[PDB]
Amino acid sequence: EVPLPQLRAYTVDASWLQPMAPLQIADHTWQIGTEDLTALLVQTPDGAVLLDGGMPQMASHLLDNMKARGVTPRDLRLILLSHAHADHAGPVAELKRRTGAKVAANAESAVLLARGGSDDLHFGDGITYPPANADRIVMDGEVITVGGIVFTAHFMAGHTPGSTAWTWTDTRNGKPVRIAYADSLSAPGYQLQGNPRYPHLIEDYRRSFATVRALPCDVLLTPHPGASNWDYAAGARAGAKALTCKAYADAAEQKFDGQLAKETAG
Amino acid sequence: EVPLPQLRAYTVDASWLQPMAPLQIADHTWQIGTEDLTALLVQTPDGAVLLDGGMPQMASHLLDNMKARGVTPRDLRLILLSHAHADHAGPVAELKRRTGAKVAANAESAVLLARGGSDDLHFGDGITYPPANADRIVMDGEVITVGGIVFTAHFMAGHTPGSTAWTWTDTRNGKPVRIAYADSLSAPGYQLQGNPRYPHLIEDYRRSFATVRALPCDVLLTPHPGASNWDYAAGARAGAKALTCKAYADAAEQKFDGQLAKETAG
Amino acid sequence: EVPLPQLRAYTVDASWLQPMAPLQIADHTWQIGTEDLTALLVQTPDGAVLLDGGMPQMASHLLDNMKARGVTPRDLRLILLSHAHADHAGPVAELKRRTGAKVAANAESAVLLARGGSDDLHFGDGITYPPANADRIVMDGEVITVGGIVFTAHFMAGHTPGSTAWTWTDTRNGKPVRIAYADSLSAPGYQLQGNPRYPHLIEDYRRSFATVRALPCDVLLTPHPGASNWDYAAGARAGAKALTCKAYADAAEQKFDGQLAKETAG
Amino acid sequence: EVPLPQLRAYTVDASWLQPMAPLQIADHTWQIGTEDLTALLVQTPDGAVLLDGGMPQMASHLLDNMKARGVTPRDLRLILLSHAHADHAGPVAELKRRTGAKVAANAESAVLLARGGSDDLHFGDGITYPPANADRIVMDGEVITVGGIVFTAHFMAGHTPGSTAWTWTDTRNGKPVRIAYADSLSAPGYQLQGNPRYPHLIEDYRRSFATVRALPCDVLLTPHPGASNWDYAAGARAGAKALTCKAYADAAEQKFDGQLAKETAG
Ligand SMILES: CC1(C)S[C@H]([C@H](NC=O)C(=O)N2CCCCCC2)N[C@H]1C(=O)O
Ligand SMILES: CC1(C)S[C@H]([C@H](NC=O)C(=O)N2CCCCCC2)N[C@H]1C(=O)O
Ligand SMILES: CC1(C)S[C@H]([C@H](NC=O)C(=O)N2CCCCCC2)N[C@H]1C(=O)O
Ligand SMILES: CC1(C)S[C@H]([C@H](NC=O)C(=O)N2CCCCCC2)N[C@H]1C(=O)O
Ligand SMILES: [Zn+2]
Ligand SMILES: [Zn+2]
Ligand SMILES: [Zn+2]
Ligand SMILES: [Zn+2]
Ligand SMILES: [Zn+2]
Ligand SMILES: [Zn+2]
Ligand SMILES: [Zn+2]
Ligand SMILES: [Zn+2]
Known part of the structure; x- marks a missing residue:
């Protein structure tokens, strides 16, 4: 006789869980997550902002890296999200319990976050x-201002309904750097055509490609660094090969068109 | 010396609170609210659907009218909403406690409903x-099917972010009737231009006019019946003067354009 | 170098996941879960009640067993819980999406259920x-009445803050049977003394032993059947060896006292 | 013909809405609400704690009084509550939006707060x-520590299920002062005996009288100052006539016993 299957944990490649020391992106912006998952700390005189936290088990590592940067738990004021999947919003609940941080998100991301990613489309x-x-x-298009850094939300629905790109301006070598943290544009295993849970999926992805292609974008970062050709383990050259927003959007669209054709053939 | 002001209740015109007996719209669709607020009951062999409930104090009257139609509390299966303001979603919490009904709504309407309309934009x-x-x-574009009546959601953001038109097909005199329950297109007292809480308000309203103009629409109904020229007190002629979806959208757009010009002058 | 650990799934003994056909307890009460996790279906003329559902992966099996009993998804009206841990409330969210059922629970169980068992004490x-x-x-002490079966809540905090015993009267062989579904009284791996997250833990367990010892109880059932000496695989003798409520409470208290002494020694 | 009644606002005596300047209770504890509603600010080196906020319309006045005390919005770290009725928790949602503050409450108060006091028992x-x-x-019995001030929760269910007394030690004239902020013990218009929504109401009130009588209590404060014989408008003598915790509990119990007798006669 045959029991029901055991629950299966969300297991990921080791590099997604490999801790790294803080890597500086611009004068006030640092990567503080793992080798293969982005978690961005933006440090202002009026407190710190975290954009994404990676997987659920990354909370203590994030707090250690914040401490190394001079950010105590009370100093973390705001958490923003690309999208509310487990590999990007995983440790948010724990971070809220252990810090002063509050979460700002769109309605779609908020409802998915409040159900812990369950009943995903x-x-x-x-x-x-x-x-x-x-x-x-x-x-x-709403802005949130922390210590004079202005973060602007750009909705880019597709990967999730609530997928968002966040943009802000930092500085580097005395000059402004317009940073674009653009969300995932992948559709891994998704039914794209005629999906009853997401009827306008294709139209939303197409609009999102156009949104990403037009973002203010001297430096692009993505939740999975490989999607924008970052290599967080490469030290002084970590960002050397990074894509432009235009190239990222074009690559995602070509991949999407191929997936549509394969779905029609399948 | 001067105390803080007393809380002010949301008071409305008497006709919005004037009970009426059920008024038949089509073979399975009835207006069961008040003279000046729509609450639609759709009766299927597999249970009943309520679209809107009006003001908070209307719950018992709605239940009385459902009983008069042969719908007991256990028979009410689903509540749908145009938008989550107090004059349309007011009695939803009470109806859920007193019936078998579950609520389906988009993410924007769900978050506003869960805060009882507080922190409105x-x-x-x-x-x-x-x-x-x-x-x-x-x-x-998602569909919900109850007893073979298919309800389709058409988002029409503007009046609220989560504003929705619901469409379904009923019958009358042996022939199909495509019913369109289109949400409000008003912007009462709203700051339209440069609103920090709703940066793309104008673009959303413009898209919503186009959405409403294109709905499948043999008979239009609106949350405030006067907006579509219904007169629920007029008996056999209640719907005689009703607007088409095209005329409703055009009228709302002309009013909106005038409001934009007045805001620029103010 | 060393990545963070992978997430670990909640894995359980195979017998907890072994499906069984419905086993009748009384005229309207059936065990419909697995060999080693209780999920009770009470069938009334006015719809069905489910008390517990077991592990998250049991939802489809529960629905299959309800169908075998003549209970369709629309007929399931109410879900009650012993306590909101994953091995007893696991499939509740899915059951709510797939049936007409609504959940009634105390405030402590409701808050734990709403966080999916996260941040457990x-x-x-x-x-x-x-x-x-x-x-x-x-x-x-509140009662809920479904089709003339009266369910009474008896709080018995300890195993969780919101732990509850549910009692009702069914019939068997023409005579009343007072059924007591008493919650777990275990404290597996818990810090009992001086626990900052549960300062009055010991006092609560002691009161709960007394509550269980006094329940109206011709037949005792427990969320883990072995705790009350049920053997759901034993057919016509499944309940033959079942403990009385008094014996269950006494055994739990003796075990608890031994655990306290071992904690003091540790 | 007769419309349904208009919604009725929760209107209160003017003194409950009469702003006052901060009144010092002990070295770090101040009354910052109105003449007739308590809202206590406790100032620590590690941020400020607010216990209650009064009515919904008091938010801006509370923030003004915090500013006068040197507490900016980012400095408010924690909000605690006596109970979650509109005249004590009214402005909590707004305070959370406008400050850094997080709320800690028991499960019963949390569920009532999350429904904005609706569906009150x-x-x-x-x-x-x-x-x-x-x-x-x-x-x-759980403690929360902010800047070395230790706040202890003492549940005292009755007025609401989640009613709580909070105790902490401050200093005055070089000596420790054990402050007890004890919740309301009134039952205004309540059905006490055989209440189906609160079956053990009487037993809970009786235990709560005993809890209050035993609190560590050099200075008692209450959500309605008159209940403990405070007169916040009396300046240097505001607390001169204050009751002890024992006298407050005894008075509440005598009033409760008289209410029980009147209910039996009614
Ligand atoms: C394409 C990814 C980089 S893989 C990861 C994905 N999770 C959610 O989408 C993920 O692990 N899956 C599990 C295994 C593969 C198929 C289902 C998906 N996140 C995606 C993203 O943000 O673009
Ligand atoms: C234009 C309406 C028919 S009046 C009502 C409105 N409430 C919310 O929007 C409403 O009572 N207000 C209070 C008084 C007027 C100004 C603020 C708005 N609902 C609108 C709708 O659904 O189109
Ligand atoms: C004692 C049980 C029968 S074992 C199970 C427990 N889960 C939650 O408490 C459970 O699997 N654990 C995982 C492994 C053992 C230690 C941590 C606990 N439920 C208990 C119950 O309802 O009495
Ligand atoms: C006895 C109070 C001082 S009067 C106020 C009460 N609200 C909630 O309980 C309140 O205004 N009511 C409205 C009018 C009287 C009857 C219903 C109650 N709060 C009580 C408290 O905290 O002891
Ligand atoms: Zn994802
Ligand atoms: Zn991902
Ligand atoms: Zn409205
Ligand atoms: Zn309206
Ligand atoms: Zn358990
Ligand atoms: Zn268990
Ligand atoms: Zn009160
Ligand atoms: Zn009060």
């Missing part, structure tokens, strides 16, 4: 994480 | 109601 | 499941 | 306010 309950509540709901 | 906490939780989140 | 995030919202909050 | 939807989410759930 494409994954069901296969990839979940501890639920968290948003403290502020943002609209498309 | 335009009204602040001036117009609130008992909070309720959604049981199902719908995406644009 | 003793387990942290080690044992989680998809979050769900309660539709009705019950107080100690 | 005794008032229904008659007395509601903007909903807010708790960030931390506390258990009976």
Whole structure:
């Protein structure tokens, strides 16, 4: 006789879980996650902002890296998200319990975060994480200002309904650097055409390619660094090969068109 | 010396609170709210659907009208909403406690409903109601089927971010009737241009006019019946003067353009 | 170099996941879960009640067993819980999406259920499941009546803060049978003395032993059947060896006292 | 013909809404609410704690008084509550949006706060306010430490299920002062005996009288100052006539016993 299957944990490549020391991107912006998952710390005189946290088990490592940067738990004021999947929003609930931080997100990301990624449009309950509540709901194009750094939300629905690009301006070598943290544009295993849970999926992805192609973007970063050709382990050359926003959008669109053709053939 | 002001209740014109008996719209669709607020009951062999409930104090009247139609509390299966303001979603929390009904709404309407209309983008906490939780989140173009009546969601953001038109096909005199319950297109007292809480408000309203103009629409109904020229007190002629979806969208757009010009002058 | 550990799934003994056909307990009460996890279906003329659902992966099996009993998804009206851990409330969110059922629970169980068992007082995030919202909050001693079966809540805090015993009267061989579904009284790996997250843990367990010892109890059932000496695989003798409520409470108290002494020695 | 009644706002005596300047209670504890509603600010080197905020319309006045005390919005770290009725938790949602503050409350208070006081066991939807989410759930006897001030929760269910007394030690004239902020012990208009929504109401009130009588209590404060014989308008003599915890508990119990006798006669 045959029991029901055991629950399967969301397991990932080791590099996604490999801790790294903080890597400086610009004068106030640092990568503080793992070798293969982005978690950006932006340090202002009026507190710190974290954009993404990676996987659920990364909370203590993130807090250690914040401490190394001079950011104590009370100094973390705001958490922003690219999208509310387990590999990017995983440790948010724990970070809220252990720091002063509040979460700002759009309505779609907020509802997915509040269910811990369960009832995902494409994954069901296969990839979940501890639920968290948003403290502020943002609209498309809304700005949030922390210590004079202005973060602008650009909705780019597709990978999730609530997928968002965040943009801000930092400095480097005395000159402004317009940073674009653009969300994933992948559709891994998704049913694209005629999806009853996401009827306008294709139209949304197409608009999102155009949104990403037009972002203010001297430096592009992505939740999975390989998607924008970053190599966080490469030290002084980590960002040397990074794509432009235009090249990232074009590559994602070509991949998407090929996936559509393969789905029609399947 | 001067105390802080007393809380001010959301008071409305008497006709919005004037009970009426059920008024038949089509073979299975009835208006069961008040003279001046729409609440639509759609009766299927597999249970009943309510679209909107009006003001918070309308719950018992709605239940009385459902009983008169042969719908007991256990028979009410689904509540859908045009938008989550107090004059349309007011009694939802109470209806959920007193019936078998579950709520389906988009993410924007769900988050506003869960805060009881508080922290409204335009009204602040001036117009609130008992909070309720959604049981199902719908995406644009998603269908919900109850007893073979197919309800399709058409997002039409503007009046609220989560504003939705719902369409379904009923019958009358042996022939199909495509019913369009289109949301409000008003912007009462709103700051339209450069609104920090709703940066793309104007673009959203413009897209929503186009969405409404294109809906499948033999009969249009609106949350405030006067907006579509219904007169629920007029008996056999209640719907005689009703606007088409095209005329409703055109009228709303002309009014909106005049409001934009007045805001620029103000 | 050393990555962070992979997430660990909540894995359990195979017998906890071994499907069984419905086993009748009384005229309207059936065990419909697995060999080693209780999930009770109570069938009334006015719909069905489910008490517990076991592990998250049991949802489809529960629905199959309900169908075999003549209970369709629309007929399931109410879900009650012993306590909101993953091995008892696991499939609640999915059952709510797939049936007409609403959840009634005390405030403590409701808050734990809404966080999917995360931030557990003793387990942290080690044992989680998809979050769900309660539709009705019950107080100690409150009754819920479905089709003339009266369910009474008896709070018995300890194993979780919101641990509850549910009692009702069914019939068998023409005579009343007072059924007591008493929650777990175990404290597996818990810090009992001086626990900062549960300062009055010991006092609560002691009161709960007394509560269980006094329940109306012709037949005792427990979330883990072995705790009350049920053997769901034993057919016509499944309940033959079952403990009385008094014996269950006494055994749990003796075990608890031994655990206290071992903790003092450790 | 007769419309349904208009919604009725929760209106209160003017003195409950009369702003006052901060009144010092001890070296770090100040009354910063109105003449007749308590809102306590405790100032530590590691941020400020607010216990209660009064009515919904008091948010801006509270923030003004915090500023006068040298507490900016980012400095407010924690909000604690006596109980989650509109006249004590009214401005919590707004304070969370406008400050860094997080809320800690027991499960019962958290669920009532999250529904904005709707579906009250005794008032229904008659007395509601903007909903807010708790960030931390506390258990009976749990401590929360801010800047070396230790706040201890003492549950005292009755007035609401989640009613809580908070105790801490401050200093005055070089000597320790054990402050007890004890919740309301009133039952205004409540059905006490055989209440289906609160079956053990009487037993809970009786235990709560005993809890209050035993609190560490050099100085008692209450959410309605008159209940403990404070007169916040009396300047240097505001606390001169204050009751002891023992006298407050005894007075509440005598009043409760008289109410029970009147209910039996009614
Ligand atoms: C394409 C990715 C880099 S892989 C990861 C994905 N999770 C969610 O989408 C993920 O692990 N899956 C599990 C295994 C593969 C198929 C299902 C998906 N995140 C994607 C992203 O952000 O673009
Ligand atoms: C234009 C309406 C028919 S009046 C009502 C409105 N409430 C929310 O929007 C409402 O009572 N207000 C209060 C008084 C007027 C100004 C603020 C708005 N609903 C609108 C709708 O659905 O189009
Ligand atoms: C004692 C049980 C029968 S074992 C199970 C427990 N989970 C939660 O408490 C559970 O699997 N653990 C994982 C492994 C053992 C130690 C941590 C606990 N439930 C208990 C119950 O309801 O009495
Ligand atoms: C007895 C109070 C001082 S009067 C106020 C009460 N609200 C909630 O309980 C309140 O205004 N009511 C409205 C009018 C009277 C009857 C219903 C109650 N709060 C009580 C408290 O905290 O002891
Ligand atoms: Zn993803
Ligand atoms: Zn990813
Ligand atoms: Zn409106
Ligand atoms: Zn309206
Ligand atoms: Zn358990
Ligand atoms: Zn268990
Ligand atoms: Zn009160
Ligand atoms: Zn009060």
